[PDB]
Amino acid sequence: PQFGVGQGSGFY
Amino acid sequence: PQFGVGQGSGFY
Amino acid sequence: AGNLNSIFQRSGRTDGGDARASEALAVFNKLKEEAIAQQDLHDDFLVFRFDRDQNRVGYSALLVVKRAAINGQQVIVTRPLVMPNDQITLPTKKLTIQNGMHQETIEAEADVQDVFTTQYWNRICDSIRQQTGKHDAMVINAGPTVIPADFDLKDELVLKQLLIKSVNLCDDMLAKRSGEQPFSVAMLKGTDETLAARLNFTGKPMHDSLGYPIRSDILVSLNRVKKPGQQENEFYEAEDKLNQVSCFVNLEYTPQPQLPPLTPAIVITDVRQAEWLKANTMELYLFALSNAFRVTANQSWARSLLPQLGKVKDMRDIGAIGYLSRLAARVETKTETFTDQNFAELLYNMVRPSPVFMSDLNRFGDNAAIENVFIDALGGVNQQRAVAAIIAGVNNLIGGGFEKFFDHNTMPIIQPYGTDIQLGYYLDGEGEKQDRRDLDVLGALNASDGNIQEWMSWYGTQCNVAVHPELRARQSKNFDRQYLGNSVTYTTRAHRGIWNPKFIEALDKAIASVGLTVAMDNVAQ
Amino acid sequence: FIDALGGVNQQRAVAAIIAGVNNLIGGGFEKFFDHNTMPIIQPYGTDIQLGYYLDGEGEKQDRRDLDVLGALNASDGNIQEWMSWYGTQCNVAVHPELRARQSKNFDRQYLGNSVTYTTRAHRGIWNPKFIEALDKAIASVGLTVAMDNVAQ
């Protein structure tokens, strides 16, 4: 349950 | 049906 | 080395790195120029190199980049294309597994999900900034993709399309950053325009962005229907497709030591917009998802469970269901003596009439910018923010009010499935590519020819979440080779979740509770 | 533990036992249950005849081997013989002397005549709340125990 993995998505 | 009791000691 | 690289990488350059990556950079540069010459693409974008010997990368990548200054902020948007190489060994994870009373270690090469870590992303950020000169720019992750090791770089058409699509995804993300006005039903609600849809049951696969097969049973196509007055198309050839959702119908075996033993599910394997629309946004994705919801109108979804013409021995045959049912035998379904009534009876006793909705979210797919939000809606540091992005997208479509149909402060949008998604393809008897998803419950029942002990071992492999995932994957690979004839060529990973039944029902009702309702045409019993 | 089953000094025996656990944990057994609503050990009623028998090499073996599975094999499936024995070991409205005589008759027929009897004993049931409190109270004060058989 690894979520919030990878940044810079520009959605929030 | 009944419980006989012998002469126990130390704890009482 | 890192303390020294700070300054001793600044002065001078070198050659080296993976030759395949150099070839890939060169073919993309060629294609870029052809697209400019033919006016398919504007000369307003850059392509950079992300490479092993400079960045200590694991996998090399090409980087497609667009730039804009938005309200004073310099913004770089990028879409990496990861390049695995079958001739290059990558370091493995040492996976220590407590197998009962003893620990054993299985090593496995890092996959693209293990390599593309937050820090890999941060090094992409910095590498592009140094190559563009915008050292203080903000960098947007438009959703990475993959160009697999296995195949000839000779498909210029695929590569050209990957470049065009990467450029478009980059533009949409800058557009989001700049406040571009959202898609909404308001632009669809023509006073002379309604929607209608068709459920396609055709026995053929879809292909993804690099030509690999996608399993589905039903294609749901949503069309724009106008009144026969004056139309813009009086001056041109025109089509009415708005969007499409591609679904697979699964079956979960849920014994009760009653209900029919198999619980069906509608699995979204792909979400697309019509080819007419260049943009790919959250609002568009969400509007299109209502197409999966409607696939279960009446009993239409169950047509996927039918037998089909003349096949002597083939995998999705419902008759395999007889091995789990009281019969403990394959049902004679392919012959002239099997009736429509017998078919209906197999479903009445073995398949529950109301399926579970779920979807496959691919971090490296073309919709990754959006699908990754849906993955984050499942948990983690930004779970509530991922939810806010999705809920806002629904509200942008309808003008507010999703919360009146689905309270997102009470219920999750997607619940975690548990078991992840093992993806890949294998070759059929003619050497064509086929989606490994073919070995579903009926598939495995047919593959083992009724050997339930083998079937159950197969089934348990992806159901018992307590089993370490490495073991689950190895066991599954062993079964696919046994069950397919060593025809697998292994490829990738994705995340799975179950849609909150209320999110999806609410999505369709919340949209309907304004605006055009879809006409449920071509009912066709 | 025997006097804690019942009788004139049951309350004192129970007090000694709960004090013993509190000495182990630093108090708090009482946070799990009331020992005056839930006496520590209940009687099982059917008491225990102890003894041993000799096996084929002359070794001493516990006479308790003719347990339910044991007795079923001894009668080779004769359920009526089994049930006569089983009732002897369960119906405690029957005076214990009568039960003891039939138990001995059954050992001679099914276990053999090479049977020696030893000092008799009582049996009782540990109150599920005593058990909950002992196990949880020890774990709750941090004396963690790992299982060696981490999975079967």
XYZ file of C-alpha atoms in Angstrom:
701
model
C 0.000 0.000 0.000
C 2.578 2.580 -1.304
C 0.652 5.654 -2.335
C 1.822 9.255 -2.831
C 4.798 7.822 -4.734
C 6.247 10.113 -7.372
C 6.042 13.880 -7.139
C 5.325 16.942 -9.293
C 1.886 15.792 -10.580
C 0.531 19.433 -10.618
C -2.961 18.174 -9.463
C -2.746 19.686 -5.907
C -20.735 -32.654 44.141
C -19.089 -31.173 47.358
C -15.548 -30.065 48.014
C -13.710 -31.380 51.013
C -10.840 -29.303 52.356
C -7.692 -30.686 53.989
C -5.308 -28.777 56.253
C -3.563 -26.493 53.731
C -1.242 -23.713 55.026
C 1.027 -20.697 54.174
C -1.472 -19.121 51.715
C -4.069 -19.285 54.552
C 31.813 11.091 -5.897
C 28.630 13.280 -5.338
C 30.569 15.882 -3.334
C 32.990 16.232 -6.219
C 30.452 15.988 -9.013
C 28.897 19.191 -7.773
C 31.716 21.036 -9.526
C 33.709 18.527 -11.612
C 30.749 17.618 -13.810
C 30.397 21.333 -14.696
C 33.576 21.526 -16.676
C 33.719 19.176 -19.654
C 31.486 16.489 -21.266
C 31.914 12.795 -22.219
C 30.574 10.176 -24.576
C 29.266 6.741 -23.524
C 26.068 5.267 -22.108
C 23.619 2.767 -23.588
C 23.763 2.553 -27.387
C 20.038 1.717 -27.504
C 19.290 4.968 -25.723
C 21.442 6.858 -28.214
C 19.553 5.192 -31.074
C 16.284 6.106 -29.442
C 17.339 9.779 -29.066
C 18.422 9.836 -32.709
C 15.215 8.296 -34.078
C 13.121 10.691 -32.048
C 15.161 13.638 -33.358
C 14.579 12.389 -36.909
C 10.867 12.005 -36.367
C 10.659 15.354 -34.666
C 12.048 17.003 -37.759
C 9.751 15.093 -40.106
C 6.747 16.164 -38.025
C 7.844 19.759 -38.172
C 8.362 19.625 -41.945
C 4.920 18.136 -42.486
C 3.256 20.492 -40.012
C 2.107 17.722 -37.729
C 4.090 19.322 -34.885
C 5.173 22.868 -34.121
C 8.850 23.540 -33.517
C 8.203 24.663 -29.959
C 9.469 21.737 -27.912
C 12.699 20.178 -26.846
C 13.830 16.604 -26.376
C 16.547 15.876 -23.807
C 18.630 12.848 -22.817
C 18.512 11.140 -19.387
C 21.422 8.718 -19.249
C 23.267 6.131 -17.103
C 26.856 7.362 -16.824
C 25.824 10.943 -15.848
C 22.885 10.231 -13.463
C 23.435 6.662 -11.955
C 19.947 5.919 -13.283
C 19.041 2.239 -13.420
C 17.002 2.717 -16.684
C 17.771 5.389 -19.340
C 15.051 7.641 -20.697
C 14.236 10.304 -23.248
C 12.601 13.444 -21.941
C 9.937 15.381 -23.867
C 9.809 18.995 -22.698
C 7.565 22.059 -23.018
C 7.930 25.342 -21.184
C 5.842 28.343 -20.187
C 5.904 31.208 -17.725
C 2.672 31.110 -15.800
C 1.763 34.133 -13.708
C 5.480 34.777 -13.195
C 6.474 31.160 -12.418
C 8.737 29.437 -14.855
C 7.292 26.021 -15.482
C 8.851 23.004 -17.163
C 6.585 20.151 -18.048
C 7.923 16.807 -18.943
C 7.112 13.292 -19.984
C 9.934 10.710 -19.647
C 10.059 7.623 -21.852
C 11.882 4.826 -20.014
C 14.080 2.457 -22.018
C 14.809 -1.074 -20.595
C 17.528 -3.101 -22.360
C 17.506 -6.912 -22.511
C 21.282 -6.985 -22.810
C 21.851 -4.981 -19.622
C 21.728 -6.467 -16.174
C 20.149 -4.304 -13.515
C 20.739 -4.717 -9.756
C 18.131 -6.625 -7.841
C 16.185 -6.246 -4.663
C 16.999 -8.759 -1.981
C 13.596 -9.885 -0.872
C 13.696 -11.742 2.407
C 10.561 -13.731 2.939
C 9.448 -15.418 6.142
C 8.224 -18.649 4.640
C 6.649 -20.286 7.618
C 9.495 -21.015 10.014
C 12.364 -20.152 7.624
C 13.590 -17.041 5.841
C 14.537 -17.416 2.193
C 15.748 -14.729 -0.190
C 14.515 -14.156 -3.709
C 16.291 -11.643 -5.816
C 14.524 -9.731 -8.533
C 15.564 -7.047 -10.995
C 14.105 -3.673 -10.227
C 11.148 -3.000 -12.511
C 10.193 0.383 -13.867
C 8.081 0.990 -10.713
C 11.054 0.220 -8.497
C 13.413 2.413 -10.478
C 11.193 5.431 -11.088
C 11.291 6.536 -7.461
C 10.643 10.000 -6.105
C 14.357 10.687 -6.249
C 14.574 9.455 -9.881
C 11.935 12.128 -10.550
C 13.953 14.728 -8.668
C 17.029 13.940 -10.821
C 14.845 14.328 -13.928
C 13.814 17.730 -12.633
C 17.377 18.821 -12.192
C 18.671 17.329 -15.434
C 16.103 19.133 -17.510
C 16.656 22.404 -15.704
C 20.356 22.243 -16.470
C 19.678 21.453 -20.144
C 17.032 24.255 -20.536
C 18.842 26.807 -18.330
C 15.767 27.363 -16.198
C 17.534 26.530 -12.975
C 14.774 27.862 -10.718
C 11.788 26.422 -12.667
C 9.000 24.289 -11.233
C 8.775 20.897 -12.923
C 5.539 19.040 -13.773
C 5.319 15.276 -14.046
C 2.966 14.715 -16.961
C 3.020 10.974 -16.424
C 5.978 8.874 -17.696
C 5.779 6.020 -20.118
C 7.907 3.083 -21.256
C 9.497 1.933 -24.522
C 10.175 -1.808 -23.724
C 13.482 -3.510 -24.584
C 12.113 -6.251 -26.844
C 11.542 -4.814 -30.334
C 12.869 -3.181 -33.517
C 13.284 0.627 -33.383
C 12.028 0.430 -37.049
C 8.399 1.382 -36.114
C 8.777 5.074 -36.878
C 4.996 5.362 -36.867
C 4.742 4.311 -33.259
C 7.613 6.483 -32.218
C 6.158 9.489 -34.048
C 2.852 8.989 -32.301
C 4.531 8.652 -28.924
C 6.206 11.987 -29.503
C 3.000 13.689 -30.573
C 1.070 12.289 -27.647
C 3.817 13.199 -25.195
C 3.760 16.751 -26.464
C -0.019 16.883 -26.055
C 0.078 15.568 -22.512
C 2.702 18.154 -21.665
C 0.504 20.939 -23.089
C -2.490 19.806 -21.083
C -0.544 19.902 -17.882
C 0.683 23.446 -18.559
C -2.885 24.338 -19.453
C -4.031 23.017 -16.110
C -1.315 25.026 -14.359
C -2.417 28.186 -16.227
C -6.120 27.744 -15.387
C -7.487 26.605 -18.807
C -11.291 26.339 -18.527
C -12.399 22.762 -17.664
C -14.481 20.409 -19.741
C -18.050 20.568 -18.607
C -21.446 19.257 -19.612
C -22.439 22.823 -20.395
C -20.554 22.617 -23.706
C -22.189 19.298 -24.549
C -25.788 20.248 -23.679
C -26.797 21.536 -27.089
C -30.489 22.402 -27.371
C -30.456 20.348 -30.551
C -28.071 17.636 -29.210
C -28.496 14.527 -27.029
C -26.351 11.531 -26.278
C -26.802 7.858 -27.115
C -24.626 4.778 -26.668
C -23.827 1.359 -27.995
C -22.401 -1.708 -26.359
C -20.042 -3.540 -28.708
C -19.535 -7.309 -28.053
C -16.985 -7.982 -30.854
C -14.336 -10.693 -30.336
C -11.175 -8.523 -31.032
C -8.525 -6.785 -28.777
C -7.410 -3.128 -28.567
C -3.848 -2.005 -28.771
C -1.998 0.470 -26.602
C 0.355 3.273 -27.570
C 3.192 0.951 -28.578
C 1.096 -1.686 -30.335
C 0.634 -4.146 -27.443
C -2.750 -5.969 -26.937
C -5.440 -4.992 -24.426
C -8.057 -7.490 -23.225
C -11.682 -6.466 -23.163
C -15.053 -8.046 -23.736
C -17.174 -4.972 -24.321
C -16.460 -1.599 -25.858
C -18.814 1.099 -24.668
C -19.099 3.856 -27.245
C -20.796 7.147 -26.367
C -22.037 9.208 -29.333
C -23.376 12.743 -30.003
C -26.742 12.732 -31.714
C -28.095 15.884 -33.328
C -31.468 16.857 -34.681
C -31.537 16.700 -38.561
C -31.543 20.441 -39.197
C -28.561 22.552 -40.127
C -25.328 20.963 -38.958
C -21.718 22.147 -39.165
C -20.926 18.911 -40.979
C -22.813 20.091 -44.048
C -19.342 21.234 -45.159
C -17.397 18.100 -44.107
C -17.254 14.380 -43.401
C -18.007 13.973 -39.706
C -18.308 11.457 -36.887
C -20.250 11.498 -33.610
C -17.903 9.671 -31.220
C -17.363 11.519 -27.917
C -15.537 8.904 -25.863
C -15.062 5.205 -25.075
C -14.503 2.892 -22.117
C -13.124 -0.589 -22.654
C -14.182 -3.203 -20.128
C -13.376 -6.806 -19.318
C -15.849 -9.023 -17.479
C -14.189 -10.995 -14.718
C -15.419 -13.645 -12.255
C -14.324 -13.924 -8.587
C -14.774 -17.318 -6.938
C -16.307 -16.866 -3.507
C -17.323 -20.272 -1.975
C -19.596 -20.336 1.077
C -18.568 -23.492 3.252
C -26.620 -19.961 -1.065
C -25.097 -17.489 -3.646
C -24.015 -18.531 -7.133
C -20.212 -19.192 -6.526
C -18.887 -16.657 -9.085
C -19.146 -12.914 -8.499
C -18.690 -10.995 -11.769
C -16.824 -7.760 -12.135
C -16.586 -4.987 -14.652
C -12.966 -4.143 -15.028
C -11.928 -1.023 -16.805
C -8.896 -1.875 -18.882
C -8.808 1.401 -20.792
C -10.398 4.881 -20.908
C -10.188 6.966 -24.062
C -11.517 10.165 -25.517
C -12.589 10.308 -29.130
C -9.745 10.881 -31.599
C -11.237 14.267 -32.360
C -10.257 15.599 -28.927
C -6.610 16.297 -28.364
C -6.897 17.050 -24.593
C -6.763 14.508 -21.758
C -8.017 15.900 -18.433
C -9.627 14.740 -15.166
C -13.032 16.009 -16.186
C -12.897 14.179 -19.473
C -11.739 10.963 -17.802
C -14.557 11.089 -15.234
C -17.231 11.847 -17.744
C -16.056 8.868 -19.848
C -16.089 6.530 -16.803
C -19.903 6.706 -16.732
C -19.696 4.477 -19.815
C -18.516 1.589 -17.685
C -21.401 2.104 -15.322
C -23.966 1.727 -18.071
C -22.457 -1.537 -19.399
C -24.484 -3.305 -16.739
C -27.808 -1.965 -17.854
C -30.240 -4.870 -17.751
C -28.204 -8.045 -18.373
C -26.243 -6.710 -21.318
C -22.914 -7.180 -19.570
C -23.527 -10.947 -19.348
C -23.375 -11.384 -23.105
C -19.606 -11.552 -22.541
C -20.148 -14.937 -20.938
C -21.680 -16.499 -24.073
C -20.132 -19.181 -26.221
C -19.318 -18.064 -29.817
C -19.120 -19.746 -33.294
C -17.390 -23.033 -34.160
C -14.325 -22.951 -31.766
C -13.102 -26.567 -31.202
C -10.959 -25.835 -28.068
C -10.750 -22.191 -26.847
C -10.259 -20.458 -23.495
C -13.251 -18.252 -22.419
C -15.840 -20.994 -22.730
C -18.499 -20.776 -20.033
C -18.703 -24.523 -20.092
C -15.551 -24.538 -17.956
C -17.785 -23.238 -15.162
C -19.168 -26.779 -14.868
C -15.928 -27.773 -13.186
C -16.666 -25.514 -10.190
C -20.405 -26.210 -10.212
C -21.982 -29.451 -8.986
C -21.312 -31.077 -12.361
C -17.534 -31.226 -11.825
C -17.336 -31.426 -15.608
C -17.110 -29.264 -18.664
C -20.544 -28.422 -19.968
C -21.089 -29.368 -23.560
C -21.582 -25.782 -24.753
C -19.948 -25.544 -28.187
C -22.236 -27.999 -29.936
C -25.593 -27.828 -31.700
C -27.293 -29.534 -28.748
C -26.592 -26.693 -26.293
C -29.532 -24.336 -25.946
C -30.062 -20.697 -24.961
C -32.028 -22.008 -22.004
C -29.115 -24.133 -20.862
C -26.858 -21.092 -21.078
C -29.203 -19.029 -18.973
C -29.308 -21.812 -16.400
C -25.529 -21.942 -16.099
C -25.610 -18.273 -15.244
C -28.595 -18.587 -12.908
C -26.813 -21.145 -10.775
C -23.144 -20.054 -11.123
C -22.998 -16.268 -11.685
C -24.324 -13.539 -9.414
C -26.495 -11.039 -11.452
C -24.866 -7.849 -10.076
C -21.108 -7.337 -10.868
C -18.484 -5.387 -8.953
C -16.995 -2.334 -10.670
C -13.211 -1.966 -10.627
C -10.271 -0.633 -12.640
C -6.629 -1.011 -13.587
C -4.525 2.138 -12.989
C -1.207 2.223 -14.868
C 1.428 4.634 -13.549
C 3.154 4.529 -16.924
C 0.084 4.605 -19.201
C -1.038 7.528 -21.396
C -3.578 8.526 -18.781
C -0.977 8.265 -15.990
C -1.224 11.921 -15.093
C -4.846 11.247 -14.113
C -4.699 7.562 -13.149
C -1.952 8.382 -10.644
C -4.395 10.681 -8.845
C -6.837 7.814 -8.621
C -4.032 5.620 -7.291
C -3.173 8.255 -4.644
C -6.872 8.522 -3.731
C -6.286 5.042 -2.177
C -3.928 6.247 0.596
C -0.598 7.895 1.407
C 0.443 11.441 2.294
C -1.784 13.059 -0.281
C -4.814 10.798 -0.109
C -7.231 13.588 0.749
C -5.664 15.812 -1.867
C -5.969 13.157 -4.558
C -9.592 12.869 -3.561
C -10.030 16.618 -3.668
C -8.658 16.635 -7.250
C -11.091 13.929 -8.387
C -14.107 15.345 -6.597
C -13.299 18.758 -8.003
C -13.135 17.192 -11.463
C -16.602 15.738 -11.030
C -17.888 19.075 -9.779
C -16.276 20.888 -12.676
C -18.258 18.620 -14.986
C -21.573 19.253 -13.273
C -21.340 22.747 -11.679
C -21.106 21.373 -8.126
C -23.249 18.903 -6.161
C -21.354 15.587 -6.457
C -21.364 15.586 -2.666
C -25.170 15.266 -2.724
C -24.851 11.832 -4.351
C -21.516 10.752 -2.806
C -20.035 12.169 0.356
C -16.274 12.037 -0.163
C -15.712 12.950 3.462
C -17.401 9.685 4.465
C -16.486 7.304 1.651
C -13.327 6.583 -0.470
C -13.508 6.964 -4.236
C -11.671 3.672 -4.810
C -10.987 0.967 -2.236
C -7.594 -0.872 -2.635
C -7.971 -4.263 -4.340
C -5.113 -5.818 -2.363
C -3.330 -7.959 -4.941
C -1.520 -5.827 -7.590
C -1.755 -6.290 -11.325
C 0.471 -8.636 -13.182
C 0.504 -7.553 -16.840
C 2.034 -8.942 -19.964
C 1.495 -10.673 -23.265
C 2.072 -14.037 -24.826
C 1.950 -15.345 -28.339
C -0.849 -17.415 -29.811
C -0.533 -20.341 -32.247
C -0.010 -18.017 -35.247
C 2.554 -15.939 -33.340
C 0.215 -12.973 -32.685
C 0.356 -11.004 -29.469
C -2.353 -11.688 -26.905
C -3.113 -10.180 -23.483
C -2.137 -12.495 -20.570
C -5.468 -11.498 -18.934
C -6.997 -14.263 -21.094
C -6.274 -16.718 -18.265
C -9.189 -15.640 -16.102
C -11.321 -18.128 -14.185
C -12.787 -19.852 -17.227
C -9.385 -19.675 -18.904
C -7.538 -21.434 -16.103
C -10.359 -24.009 -15.732
C -9.947 -24.852 -19.404
C -6.139 -24.744 -19.242
C -6.000 -27.338 -16.461
C -8.711 -29.435 -18.206
C -10.745 -29.563 -15.008
C -7.932 -30.229 -12.630
C -9.304 -28.201 -9.780
C -6.407 -28.797 -7.504
C -4.242 -27.050 -10.153
C -6.936 -24.416 -10.712
C -7.208 -23.630 -7.029
C -3.477 -23.344 -6.658
C -3.581 -20.875 -9.565
C -6.534 -19.019 -8.165
C -5.076 -18.741 -4.629
C -1.855 -17.346 -6.101
C -3.540 -13.967 -6.788
C -6.155 -14.046 -4.003
C -4.322 -14.739 -0.794
C -2.955 -11.294 -0.078
C -0.922 -12.715 2.828
C 1.475 -14.384 0.374
C 4.509 -12.256 -0.302
C 3.990 -10.698 -3.815
C 7.246 -12.068 -5.164
C 5.992 -15.567 -4.568
C 2.683 -14.675 -6.054
C 4.378 -13.422 -9.208
C 6.713 -16.402 -9.568
C 3.904 -18.873 -9.099
C 1.761 -17.030 -11.624
C 4.531 -17.054 -14.185
C 4.932 -20.789 -13.664
C 1.210 -21.286 -14.285
C 1.126 -19.123 -17.384
C 3.955 -21.039 -18.922
C 2.240 -24.367 -18.126
C -1.166 -23.087 -19.209
C 0.065 -21.283 -22.440
C 2.894 -23.558 -23.731
C 5.866 -21.318 -22.776
C 4.551 -18.512 -24.988
C 4.879 -15.675 -22.472
C 7.088 -12.669 -23.128
C 6.811 -10.851 -19.739
C 6.325 -7.020 -19.709
C 4.944 -4.938 -16.743
C 3.047 -3.874 -13.523
C -0.028 -1.745 -12.560
C -2.211 -1.015 -9.492
C -5.737 -2.281 -8.953
C -8.624 -0.824 -7.079
C -12.323 -1.439 -6.609
C -14.587 1.445 -7.311
C -16.659 2.487 -4.403
C -20.081 1.377 -5.741
C -21.439 4.689 -4.493
C -18.807 6.813 -6.250
C -19.660 5.380 -9.625
C -23.409 5.235 -9.151
C -23.211 8.813 -7.880
C -21.050 9.871 -10.796
C -23.704 8.787 -13.254
C -26.584 10.192 -11.180
C -24.817 13.446 -10.408
C -24.260 14.073 -14.077
C -27.759 12.975 -15.045
C -29.309 15.206 -12.345
C -28.358 18.031 -14.702
C -28.221 17.988 -18.476
C -28.599 15.431 -21.290
C -29.274 11.847 -20.259
C -27.788 9.114 -22.523
C -30.275 7.205 -24.721
C -29.849 3.434 -24.007
C -30.247 2.514 -27.733
C -29.681 -0.880 -29.496
C -31.166 -2.973 -26.609
C -31.276 -5.922 -29.059
C -32.603 -9.133 -27.345
C -5.889 -24.417 43.087
C -7.981 -27.321 44.387
C -9.497 -25.379 47.264
C -10.187 -22.553 44.780
C -12.720 -24.959 43.133
C -15.163 -24.656 46.051
C -15.634 -25.412 49.745
C -15.158 -23.597 53.062
C -11.982 -21.799 52.073
C -12.662 -21.143 48.393
C -12.567 -17.414 48.916
C -9.160 -17.565 50.538
C -7.727 -19.854 47.885
C -9.042 -17.560 45.153
C -7.622 -14.502 46.889
C -4.196 -16.194 46.987
C -4.328 -16.989 43.281
C -5.327 -13.543 42.125
C -2.664 -12.092 44.402
C -0.128 -14.400 42.761
C -0.911 -13.082 39.336
C -0.869 -9.469 40.562
C 2.570 -10.147 41.960
C 3.604 -11.208 38.439
C 2.264 -8.110 36.733
C 2.435 -5.302 39.353
C -1.338 -5.296 39.822
C -4.193 -4.977 37.317
C -5.613 -8.545 36.999
C -8.798 -6.930 38.324
C -8.930 -4.674 35.261
C -9.883 -7.693 33.177
C -12.521 -9.379 35.371
C -14.257 -9.876 38.707
C -12.905 -13.010 40.436
C -15.901 -13.005 42.749
C -18.314 -13.399 39.814
C -15.904 -15.630 37.936
C -14.236 -18.202 40.301
C -10.852 -19.200 38.973
C -11.377 -22.949 38.424
C -14.648 -24.879 37.941
C -15.025 -28.617 38.686
C -15.039 -31.054 35.753
C -17.047 -33.556 37.889
C -15.643 -36.878 36.510
C -12.388 -37.315 38.469
C -9.203 -38.974 37.302
C -7.996 -42.499 37.902
C -4.258 -42.524 37.458
C -2.031 -45.459 36.745
C 0.163 -47.032 34.132
C 0.307 -50.164 32.080
C 3.085 -52.106 30.552
C 3.625 -52.174 26.818
C 4.993 -55.054 24.709
C 8.602 -54.387 25.823
C 7.605 -53.919 29.474
C 7.826 -50.089 29.536
C 5.519 -47.996 31.701
C 2.869 -46.111 29.774
C 0.125 -43.774 31.041
C -3.299 -45.546 31.378
C -4.866 -42.341 29.997
C -4.028 -43.618 26.515
C -7.540 -45.153 26.290
C -9.050 -41.739 25.567
C -11.821 -41.263 23.060
C -9.794 -42.302 19.985
C -8.037 -44.980 22.060
C -11.237 -46.573 23.326
C -12.784 -46.574 19.804
C -9.858 -48.555 18.462
C -9.822 -50.822 21.513
C -13.412 -51.943 20.843
C -12.612 -52.046 17.098
C -15.687 -50.034 16.243
C -18.070 -51.662 18.648
C -19.889 -48.464 19.479
C -22.097 -50.070 22.069
C -19.025 -51.135 24.047
C -17.547 -47.675 23.532
C -20.677 -45.871 24.681
C -20.968 -47.996 27.801
C -17.432 -46.912 28.685
C -17.957 -43.348 27.553
C -21.071 -42.982 29.734
C -19.033 -44.385 32.644
C -16.536 -41.544 32.142
C -19.177 -38.794 31.728
C -22.332 -39.414 33.761
C -21.467 -38.169 37.200
C -24.848 -38.793 38.743
C -23.447 -42.267 39.143
C -21.595 -42.741 42.387
C -17.793 -42.699 41.645
C -17.233 -46.133 43.136
C -19.506 -47.638 40.531
C -17.695 -45.718 37.865
C -14.290 -46.730 39.202
C -15.252 -50.387 39.139
C -16.421 -50.227 35.550
C -13.358 -48.240 34.511
C -11.141 -50.963 35.944
C -13.226 -53.665 34.231
C -12.723 -51.868 30.904
C -8.941 -51.633 31.405
C -8.646 -55.353 31.986
C -10.550 -56.107 28.760
C -9.069 -53.369 26.547
C -5.717 -52.273 28.018
C -4.668 -55.594 29.535
C -4.158 -57.095 32.974
C -0.685 -55.555 33.339
C -2.118 -52.424 34.879
C -0.985 -50.688 38.038
C -3.018 -48.002 39.680
C -1.535 -44.885 41.262
C -2.701 -41.861 43.265
C -5.947 -40.312 41.984
C -6.508 -36.668 40.991
C -9.075 -33.922 40.424
C -9.769 -32.043 37.234
C -11.149 -28.568 36.673
C -11.775 -25.941 34.036
C -9.876 -22.729 33.994
C -12.223 -19.806 33.872
C -11.886 -18.156 30.387
C -11.662 -14.765 32.123
C -8.772 -15.920 34.331
C -7.065 -16.986 31.188
C -7.800 -13.728 29.385
C -6.467 -11.720 32.268
C -3.330 -13.766 32.776
C -2.325 -13.738 29.134
C -3.276 -10.184 28.382
C -1.947 -8.807 31.642
C 1.503 -10.226 30.979
C 1.520 -9.002 27.375
C 0.117 -5.611 28.489
C 3.043 -4.915 30.766
C 5.468 -5.505 27.895
C 6.700 -9.041 28.467
C 6.465 -9.903 24.801
C 6.858 -13.486 23.658
C 7.583 -14.450 20.050
C 6.248 -17.589 18.480
C 8.954 -19.818 17.066
C 6.538 -21.587 14.731
C 6.008 -18.286 12.845
C 3.822 -20.079 10.289
C 2.777 -23.773 10.080
